[PDB]
Write a protein that binds this ligand. Structure first.
Ligand SMILES: Nc1ncnc2c1ncn2[C@@H]1O[C@H](COP(=O)(O)OP(=O)(O)OP(=O)(O)O)[C@@H](O)[C@H]1O
Ligand SMILES: Nc1ncnc2c1ncn2[C@@H]1O[C@H](COP(=O)(O)OP(=O)(O)OP(=O)(O)O)[C@@H](O)[C@H]1O
Ligand SMILES: *[C@@H]1O[C@H](CO)[C@@H](O[C@@H]2O[C@H](CO)[C@@H](O)[C@H](O)[C@H]2NC(C)=O)[C@H](O)[C@H]1NC(C)=O
Ligand SMILES: *[C@@H]1O[C@H](CO)[C@@H](O[C@@H]2O[C@H](CO)[C@@H](O)[C@H](O)[C@H]2NC(C)=O)[C@H](O)[C@H]1NC(C)=O
Ligand SMILES: *[C@@H]1O[C@H](CO)[C@@H](O)[C@H](O)[C@H]1NC(C)=O
Ligand SMILES: *[C@@H]1O[C@H](CO)[C@@H](O)[C@H](O)[C@H]1NC(C)=O
Lengths: 435, 431
């Protein structure tokens, strides 16, 4: 039969989560306050669209429809995660980002600043994906489009080979599918899409700078480039073949005006060579100190970081410098796992230093451990349910077989690490229950 | 006598460097082209200053004998400045004493205004730094001392806070000069009247509006977006004076373009047991076959940079910068050393990975390290002596100074390990 279907039909994936949702105070957005904010944005967008049409030389207006996928997605964000388990709203949102036509395109706000005044210090930073764009669909929803990395390192002399995000777009897609399978529900829905850069980007953008950077390749391909990255001799161009370009689309979170977010540094982003001969991943003194440092003094926050370390270890992401949280949900709120483009880069190496929070603190959520133990059994094998889940995406296969099988190998390392913690402290100390 | 004086009088610190400079192609700037560019900027600044003052004095003239002008014209293929340079000595004094005439935000921080997004704010970033311009038209990067405790910055993680930030920029330059790397810009400490020398001289209305008087009757200025993100957001005089670090500006990118290059050893990896990462050569054997590390000079320069970073315990050298004119094999600029001198009781040997994996080192670099390990030229003694010249003396406490001796011994013991495995001929490269 189907292992993915058996997984979500399993009793474990149908246990109600505690404490139950109390409606208002547990939802991220207030429906009436958020809807009138979106209605003002749609009226704003229609005014710009009517005036822009007059400035050039030339359809019915757009209406904010409450039943849109992204609207229900935003209103569905609650204290338990970004989305619900076995959610038909997420399924509809994935299809909508995959098929809906685009109506506008622009740069991301963080890259509109780096249009200068070209300085290679703020351009060659890691984890930064230049040439990415924000697309707006016909239902007014927005997604972050990260195009596939195409240029080899000979075309980018400054880039170091083993740091290039070759798997960049595949990593965003597969990280969401693993998030759903693990039932963390902490990364935004993400799909692959083959995009006509001419029709769905160049012909819909109102940004004159983005219009001017499009050009025709000597091989008769349609391309757009970033000028400042080109001068810094890093990645600067992507091209259709001759029009179609493959990439990843990630659904936008609610506006920071409606839901502010904080960025918090990851205390385990770096490992340290301790004075011999105790190993870093096994020594608990660091976490013993972090446990006494706000906000890691409360149980939920440290357990959430341990969840994030397990997720990062599974995808081999060494670049989680910071994690983000919603302000409304306070310190005990869940962590948002954004920008996973640095994952799934090395299928033949497992960086156990990512697991350091688990191996040092020696505690784990009961829910998290049961899901990992279930995904290690043959009937629910993690590589099988992942491969099956990823067949839904337009860019199937998202992950090759070596990456899928590495998920099973890294899962065994996580469970074998849990065994080590239990030997040293007992199940009562390691396996923490939820309020 | 004086160990610092004995160091620079030693024969080693007076050997002429090969190959000798051939004048034109070895200097960074073309004198006549750069001087007319600076003269246009001074005329521009006088034009901006004449209109601004009318909306509410004799003009400024670009003087060739100014310290920073000779500093810029002195940059050549061998480093940012010359050994035992009286121009550098004058520049350190000028940045310490000259009055300011203008103040503004750094260019990279004018972008984050803002439009507040905490992702681009909590990035090694000093958001309260300012660029000051002196009466001789020279510019310096002012990084104020970190004052706010972590209770006032709920998002900041304690062991990541750059408490030693301003002292680290100063001490990193003094160590750069003592090592004779000559690769970081001259840097001084200064106790700055934030009212007289910043608020009353800036033409940026936003910077004017962020100044306020503390309830404790201190003069402060703050950053709005960092405050909302619950990170470091304010520094204060007591009630006017605030100490910080001043780093001399490099020439304009219009005159001398620079590239940023990722450090291939910024991260360490857990190899399959039980071979250690810093000792296993397979990684550098691969990097040696990857441009531009296939040529000798570039890899040796990175190894120099790793030695420097290990001495100061800087784990945050994600990128290094180079001048475009000098092409490959050019020297590396060691900028923004604010993350150094943070842990005096811990030695992160993974920083030394380029040396311990590649097992090669410059002959010049090794001889300077071997000399600085001897009692008569002890690195901690010459550093402590050198740092007494700064207004914020001692700049470094005793644990940080003594850690320099311990890390120097670790570097030398690593070289011995390389020589045992490959012999002196393979490890010690000549120029
Ligand atoms: N799913 C996501 N993946 C990656 N980054 C995201 C995602 N959602 C939001 N962001 C980040 O948040 C920014 C959008 O923040 P903002 O609050 O401006 O949203 P907005 O809807 O554009 O705001 P406004 O309501 O003013 O138009 C993006 O530039 C991006 O960097
Ligand atoms: N000593 C230094 N330490 C650290 N960073 C520096 C130093 N000198 C220069 N920089 C960096 O290099 C950048 C150079 O900027 P820029 O090219 O605008 O210089 P400029 O002289 O202001 O140029 P312009 O001729 O346009 O005025 C600065 O923004 C600064 O961040
Ligand atoms: C992708 O989009 C482009 C642009 O709309 C399509 O190209 C055009 O349609 C036909 C086919 O060449 C021509 O008569 C038009 O003149 C083209 N327009 C432009 C602006 O070039 C293209 O067909 C789409 N599909 C693919 C697979 O490329
Ligand atoms: C720092 O600078 C301020 C401003 O120049 C000095 O304050 C002034 O002191 C004079 C008398 O010496 C008064 O006439 C002004 O009204 C003061 N201005 C303000 C804003 O208070 C201050 O004395 C300086 N502090 C030093 C040099 O330590
Ligand atoms: C965690 O520590 C903070 C310290 O400010 C305290 O306010 C909070 O009540 C503590 N919570 C728990 C669950 O220990
Ligand atoms: C290193 O490789 C580049 C390009 O592959 C080449 O131009 C250069 O000459 C090589 N280095 C040496 C020392 O030959």
């Amino acid at each position: 039969s189907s292992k993915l279907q058996a997984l979500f039909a399993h009793p474990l994936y149908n246990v109600p989560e505690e404490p139950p949702l109390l409606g208002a105070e547990d939802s991220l957005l207030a429906s009436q306050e958020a809807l009138r904010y979106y209605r003002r944005k749609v009226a704003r967008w229609n005014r710009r669209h009517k005036m822009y049409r007059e400035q050039m030389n030339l359809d019915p207006p757009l209406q904010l429809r409450l039943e849109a996928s992204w609207v229900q997605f935003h209103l569905g964000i609650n204290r338990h995660g970004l989305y619900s388990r076995s959610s038909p709203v997420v399924s509809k949102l994935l299809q909508d980002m995959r098929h809906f036509p685009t109506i506008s395109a622009d740069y991301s706000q963080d890259e509109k600043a780096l249009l200068g005044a070209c300085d290679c210090t703020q351009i060659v930073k890691p984890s930064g994906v230049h040439l990415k764009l924000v697309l707006r669909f016909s239902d007014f929803g927005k997604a972050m489009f990260k195009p596939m990395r195409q240029q080899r390192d000979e075309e980018t002399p400054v880039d170091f080979f083993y740091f290039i995000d070759f798997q960049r777009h595949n990593a965003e897609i597969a990280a969401f599918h693993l998030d759903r399978i693990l039932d963390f529900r902490r990364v935004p829905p993400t799909v692959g899409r083959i995009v006509n850069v001419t029709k769905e980007i160049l012909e819909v953008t109102k940004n004159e700078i983005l219009q001017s950077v499009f050009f025709v390749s000597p091989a008769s391909n349609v391309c757009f480039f970033a000028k400042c990255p080109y001068m810094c001799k890093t990645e600067y161009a992507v091209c259709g073949k001759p029009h179609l370009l493959e990439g990843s689309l990630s659904a936008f979170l609610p506006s920071l005006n409606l839901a502010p977010r904080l960025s918090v540094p990851n205390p385990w982003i770096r490992s340290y060579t301790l004075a011999g001969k105790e190993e870093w991943e096994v020594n608990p003194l660091y976490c013993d100190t972090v446990k006494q440092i706000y906000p890691y003094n409360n149980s939920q926050r440290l357990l959430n970081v341990i969840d994030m370390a397990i997720f990062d270890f599974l995808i081999g992401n060494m670049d989680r410098h910071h994690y983000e949280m919603f302000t409304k949900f306070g310190d005990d709120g869940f962590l948002i796992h954004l920008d996973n483009a640095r994952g799934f880069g090395r299928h033949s190496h497992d960086e156990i230093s990512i697991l350091s929070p688990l191996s040092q603190c020696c505690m784990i959520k009961k829910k998290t451990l049961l899901h990992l133990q279930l995904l290690a059994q043959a009937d629910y094998r993690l590589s099988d349910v992942m491969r099956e889940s990823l067949l839904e995406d337009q860019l199937s296969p998202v992950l090759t077989e070596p990456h899928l099988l590495a998920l099973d190998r890294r899962l065994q390392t996580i469970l074998r690490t849990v065994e080590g913690c239990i030997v040293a402290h007992g199940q009562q100390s390691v396996i923490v229950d939820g309020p």
